[PDB]
Design a binder for this molecule. Structure first.
Ligand SMILES: [Cl-]
Ligand SMILES: [Hg+2]
Ligand code: NA
Ligand SMILES: [Zn+2]
Ligand SMILES: [Zn+2]
Ligand SMILES: [Zn+2]
Lengths: 28, 29, 29
């Protein structure tokens, strides 16, 4: 249970670092 | 405490999937 | 480690809010 939520939070972190990168491509 | 932290991340995950779909639109889908 | 994990999700939540403001600014704009 503990590990699962740590795994989840790390995965959301990476998904978020992915969106910030996609967001960078549109900006000049 | 645990149940609150779980619902928080579940809601942030939902908010992220919506931001993902916005990037799928701009990409020109 | 509640303190360490709650720190992580708070920073995650703010980065998500920041990005949500930016997509909102795009529609207006
Ligand atoms: Cl975004
Ligand atoms: Hg989390
Ligand atoms: Na930018
Ligand atoms: Zn974006
Ligand atoms: Zn707590
Ligand atoms: Zn430990």
């Amino acid at each position: 249970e503990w590990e699962a939520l740590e795994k989840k939070v790390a995965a959301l972190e990476s998904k978020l670092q992915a969106l910030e990168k996609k967001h960078e491509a549109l900006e000049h």
